[PDB]
């Protein structure tokens, strides 16, 4: 089992949330956290476009990267509940960027496959540190 899990094989993924928070704080890079499920078709459709998007793949290099098939113990990572796929951003100050939301009012951190441009904008927002 690789850490990539099909999200970006050329990327450097971190294994655990604890380690990812340490990396973010010590490197002054924001942390991007992708929650998904292998059995979820929504997760799989988003993964496909994410992995194939060269802009996302390149910009991802400026982040600490974590993808999870199981929820963390940090409630700040699910401000409107636990659902997948869900992409959360954390600032190097260890402040969860709950203000970096996607398109949808009912699922504030969900992305659909057509929402890659908005995802890019939100990654750029994450890079404007608090």
């Amino acid at each position: 089992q690789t850490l990539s899990r099909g999200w970006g094989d050329q990327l450097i993924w971190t294994q655990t949330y604890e380690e990812a928070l340490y990396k973010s704080k010590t490197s002054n890079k924001p942390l991007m956290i992708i929650h998904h499920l292998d059995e979820c078709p929504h997760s799989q459709a988003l993964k496909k476009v994410f992995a194939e998007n060269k802009e996302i793949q390149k910009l991802a290099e400026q982040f600490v990267l974590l993808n999870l098939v199981y929820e963390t113990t940090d409630k700040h990572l699910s401000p409107d509940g636990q659902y997948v796929p869900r992409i959360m951003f954390v600032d190097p100050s260890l402040t969860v960027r709950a203000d970096i939301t996607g398109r949808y009012s009912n699922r504030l951190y969900a992305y659909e496959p057509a929402d890659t441009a908005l995802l890019l904008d939100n990654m750029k927002k994450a890079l404007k540190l608090l």
């Binding site: 509940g81 636990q82 659902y83 100050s93 402040t95 969860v96 709950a98 504030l108 969900a110 659909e112």
Partner: peptide
């Protein structure tokens, strides 16, 4: 307060809200 999606599956940091 905006569009909705049904394309999800239901299962010491600070936080900054919108």
């Amino acid at each position: 307060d905006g569009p909705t999606t049904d394309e999800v599956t239901l299962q010491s940091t600070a936080v900054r809200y919108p």
